């Protein structure tokens, strides 16, 4: 049975990376309303402008989605202005970053592990074969006035962002509270991380070695955990298939002789093919609609995970955050962003206790008369001898004047016991 | 008139509880878009395949979304892995939580609060009465097209979650600042939740009786408090009136000289039941089109609410957030969740001053030459002598060398008082 | 090159205000669908009815629409339940909040501030001007179907609301963590501010006359920084226009003879007549539908707006918040919220460092053996000396054992220096 004296308390600790993977934006994309519902048929495009400003306001909610795409990007990556240059040194405490900073010798300036995410996720590349030089009106015919656009922000131009937000200020003055999560001095900026979180300074500094070994293996252990990116990859294959139900509805003859106007023009007479061009029209359109709907609602669902990103950024990588489970699981130290296709990817650093055993407490010591309590963290008993400690680290220190504060009295306290406080100016007095 | 020098210190308080219901979920659905368009009709059938893929894309649409709703249950309880036993004790230092703890004497195993809010919130009946036993295909018939789902966590297993997250880890060793709102020391940990918000540990311990009744008595009042839950039953609601609108409208002859196939076919020649047939299904889908568009939209709501519902869990309940209004008003320590009908309700605990009066005060205490500034709260006048005490209780202390500090000059603060500072080694020299 | 002991520290600062604008809400609106498609028409009438309940439906989704527009206002606004009268000293330590506070002189009691945001931000107009008394009917008819409602919260409310917030509880009380931003005693609550940033109270009530004369020019700042705007005029471009779009397409012979009911009546036999009226039909309930799914989608994004608003309120204005960059730029001090033509706009007030220096630091410093770590802040070398203190300013102050722990060992810790640490009691004894 369990007595209501009984307190776990941490003897160790472990450090842990866990990855966490956001949908920040989509591909751009711009259908032409026009000569998707009519080819090179003028009697298709009068016909058009009978039915209204349908066409023109279906043109007008693809474009503004489009252009939130690229404002999703800008809010979460353009938080930092610095340029990031190369650190001389490559050496912070015995503490491996390599695998998460830019690796010069390649082609495109990424890290070993954005390089692995790069390569993992996986119409549009068809449009892409027609295209190379810049006969985008060509393409546009070829594919039905379906069309991809490119993004205001380059593969490259994201790199950088993400190296000044990792890093930036390596050279230049370390910023112990207002700057990126990678600064020379890193032994005192982690001191200054697990003071957050109510760990004494003394555990880092005592502990250097073991910490930055279980860091290094940790760093290992998510370039082989990296499934995994199905969470980037269905952003492709939901948008893809969107674009596949454009592309085969063209061919569906909706109550018409069929799906192809010069079938419908030739071999008809005139007021029968207008009746036949119009009910194609009407199918058409109608699918057009369903498409751009579609769009609209998705967009906003990438929209909100954008925010969100850029939220956790400026509270996980540029900050942190004490909010339970918003940085990842545990205590949270500190947050290492990684470039992604169609997103980013956070690696939470936190911290995780271990080897709990209990120990017996007590609300306060009863001196002389008067209660005596803990100035912070918790009194425990190691079977004849009572210490103060702290919560998230056993450390007993003796009880002192110095550690305790004085309050109402012995006689009020329900849970009080009997235990003698130690005065540190008697031994100088004699 | 108000002076410049004059502060409102509370000298008593109250413990409130405060209630906050979320619609986490809401009923899956499916909807057979080819039973629904197309009856026993082969004719209608083969009409409706020369539309495209329309019909086929509608099934995914709604499909997705009946999955989405077990992903927001989980995300919101599926955060605990406890087992979650029961606990000898009944007693928790005279606080009484039996009306929020599961009762073991019940078939299911609710609390007596769960039970009231489950008999509270009350299509779906008839198809739930057509079935009992697993013939899905023959309501599907009767019917139209449109099923019920069931969920994928039952009413059971979410008790068992809240009981894991409510309290879970009672027996084998308190967790102070990692685990559950509910552990068996409990006058301990909240001693370390009044001073989390700024109030000294003795503030408790020395009223223990007091607040244990307030608690006691605020959560009866919630009974009788539990209109309330209408947030809720807008859910089935809401729901219930869009599979009206979809059944109600299988009767509207849209342009058609009729609603029932059967009277289409029969005494109509054939080209001019096509013609008839083809109107139904363009108002049929165009019908089932704006279903779908507004259960996309709706679940887009529930999907925010599930989210902020798994945040304030995280963060209320396995947590102490110090954001404002966040887990209600007042200053926050503590939360218990309880299940409910589609939703989650959270019970909040917060600390409310009370019977406040202003007592004068000053920035600092000049003693010789030299300015005093408080080390923590604030400096306050009785009428006749200066004491040093915090802001969220009123208890005077002695203003000695070891509750300020010293910094500046006293001819540099302006509102600067003449007082005396103890030193309190002076009587040990001597 | 860089080294691995070099910290940067502030050692001067500055005073800023940013400006942030929530699209809180927008304009009410409703359409009534049997007007809008059928006008002065039986024949319309009857053919409407015959395709069932979706304009019935329709009017019912747009007045879900209006009636969320209050609830967005009163969730951000109606927080706080105080009169707010006058303040009769007008001086709160040299600060100026004449121009964020009402004008008793004006008929609309606006802030000059307000007051500039009002006459900035600019069909709506063309209802409002054929009414003015109360007519509803006969504006509705002649703007077919369309017509605006009022607001439940006129300007007047806001603007009291908006005075409550800010100030309120100016006289009887001062409440140091549980109230508004303007209170009395503005210098002490400044002192609470800086405290909740790291920086010591001494800074402020050293630098008064500094800092209230930066707040005052910074203030004035934003009346010429007052583009800007641009957000909120967003808000009334876009429901112009989509309105524009349902008055267009009227216009629209969609398939038709003609796009007037009245032409299609006349000089045409009656079965003739009922296909063309229902092509109309058809073709004015595809546009309204369009249209009503357009502001479901857009008021979905306003109404997130509004919680975010309501949000930042609470953990901005009524707290001090403590997210990196969640109010403002740099330390967050306070805000001060305005009104706004259909939003809020904040002032948020933060606390910036300036003129930075790189000093040399260390871990920690070995006295006799043992190493001293500091009890908060940094330790630093001026070139000749070592001295502690703080990270956010740079303030000097002798180290010493009352500004120390000991823990571990002289020979544990890496980087460990060779410096004094001074015992305060030796000079009493003797
Ligand atoms: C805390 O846990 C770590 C990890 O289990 C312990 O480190 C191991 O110590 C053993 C014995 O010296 C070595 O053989 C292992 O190789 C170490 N592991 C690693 C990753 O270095 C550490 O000793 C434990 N601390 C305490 C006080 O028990
Ligand atoms: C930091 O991590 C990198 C990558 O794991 C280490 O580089 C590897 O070192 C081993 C051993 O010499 C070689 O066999 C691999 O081929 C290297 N890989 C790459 C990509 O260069 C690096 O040595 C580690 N540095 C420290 C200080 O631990
Ligand atoms: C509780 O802690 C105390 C202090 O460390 C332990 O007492 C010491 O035990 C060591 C090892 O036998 C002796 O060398 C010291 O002289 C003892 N000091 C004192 C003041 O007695 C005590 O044994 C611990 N109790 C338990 C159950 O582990
Ligand atoms: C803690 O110390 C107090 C004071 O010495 C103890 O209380 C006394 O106990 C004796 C023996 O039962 C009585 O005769 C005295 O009258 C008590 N004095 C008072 C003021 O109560 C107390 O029992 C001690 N508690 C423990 C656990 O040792
Ligand atoms: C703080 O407020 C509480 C509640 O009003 C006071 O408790 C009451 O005290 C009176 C007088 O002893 C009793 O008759 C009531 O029955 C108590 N109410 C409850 C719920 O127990 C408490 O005394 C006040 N504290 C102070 C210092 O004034
Ligand atoms: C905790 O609350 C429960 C429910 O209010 C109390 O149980 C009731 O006790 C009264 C008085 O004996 C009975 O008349 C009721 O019939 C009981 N209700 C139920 C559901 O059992 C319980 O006694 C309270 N316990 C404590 C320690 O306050
Ligand atoms: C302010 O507090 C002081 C200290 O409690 C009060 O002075 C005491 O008053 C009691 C009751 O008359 C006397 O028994 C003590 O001897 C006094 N102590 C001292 C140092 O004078 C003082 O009266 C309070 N002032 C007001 C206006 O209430
Ligand atoms: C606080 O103490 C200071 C120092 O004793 C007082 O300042 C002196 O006041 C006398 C009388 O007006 C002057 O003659 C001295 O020249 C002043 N000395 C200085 C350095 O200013 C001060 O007036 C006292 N304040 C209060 C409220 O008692
Ligand atoms: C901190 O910066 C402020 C602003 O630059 C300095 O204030 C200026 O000081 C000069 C010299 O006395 C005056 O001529 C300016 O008019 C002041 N500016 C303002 C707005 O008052 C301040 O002196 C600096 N503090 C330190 C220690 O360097
Ligand atoms: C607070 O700010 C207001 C507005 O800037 C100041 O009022 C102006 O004062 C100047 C100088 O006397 C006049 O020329 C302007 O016409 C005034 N404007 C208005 C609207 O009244 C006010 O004096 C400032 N108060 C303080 C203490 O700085
Ligand atoms: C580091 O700070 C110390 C203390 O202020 C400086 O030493 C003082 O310098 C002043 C000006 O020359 C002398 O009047 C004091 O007597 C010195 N005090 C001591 C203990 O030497 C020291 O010069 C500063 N070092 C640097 C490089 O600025
Ligand atoms: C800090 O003080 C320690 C202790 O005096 C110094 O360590 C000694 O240095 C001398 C000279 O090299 C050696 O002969 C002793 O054997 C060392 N003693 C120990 C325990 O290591 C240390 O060098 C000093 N460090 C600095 C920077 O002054
Ligand atoms: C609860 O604590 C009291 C006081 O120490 C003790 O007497 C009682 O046995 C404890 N309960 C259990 C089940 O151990
Ligand atoms: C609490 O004590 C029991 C009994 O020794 C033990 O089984 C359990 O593991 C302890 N709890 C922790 C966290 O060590
Ligand atoms: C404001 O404080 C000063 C200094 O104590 C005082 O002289 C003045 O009377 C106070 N103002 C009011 C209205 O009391
Ligand atoms: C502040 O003082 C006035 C005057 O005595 C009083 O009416 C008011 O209630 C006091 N404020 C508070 C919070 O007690
Ligand atoms: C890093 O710190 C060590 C110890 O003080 C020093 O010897 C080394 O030169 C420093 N590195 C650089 C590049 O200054
Ligand atoms: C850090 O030191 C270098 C070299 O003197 C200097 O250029 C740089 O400005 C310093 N950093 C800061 C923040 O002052």
Redesign the interface.
Known sequence: ????????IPTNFTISVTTEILPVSMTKTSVDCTMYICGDSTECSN?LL?????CT?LNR?LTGIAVEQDKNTQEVFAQVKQIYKTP??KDFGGFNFSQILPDPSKPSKRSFIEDLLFNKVTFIKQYGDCLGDIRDLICAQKFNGLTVLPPLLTDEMIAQYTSALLAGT?????????GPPLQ??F??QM?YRFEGI?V???VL??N?KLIANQFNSAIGKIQDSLSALGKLQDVVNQNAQALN?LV??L?????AISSVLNDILSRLDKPEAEVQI?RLIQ?RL??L??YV??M??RA??YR?SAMLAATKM??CV??Q?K????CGKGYHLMSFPQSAPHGVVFLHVTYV?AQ?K?FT?A??ICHDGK?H??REG?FVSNGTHWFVTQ??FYEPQIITTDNT?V??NCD????IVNNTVYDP?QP??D
Chains 1, 2, 3 share one sequence.
């Open positions: 049975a369990c007595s209501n004296n009984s307190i776990a016909l009978q039915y209204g400003s349908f306001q909610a001389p040194i390596i050279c230049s003055g370390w910023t112990p509270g207002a020379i001095p032994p005192m001191a109510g004494t300074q003394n500094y005592e250097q139900f085969k509805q061919s569906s003859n909706c109550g119009q199918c109608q699918s609609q369903t709907t579609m609209l609602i906003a669902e909100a400026s509270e540029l900050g955050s909010r339970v489970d918003f206790p709990e209990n407490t609300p306060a209660a309590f803990p918790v919560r998230n504060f309050s109402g009020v306290v329900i849970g100016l100088e007095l």
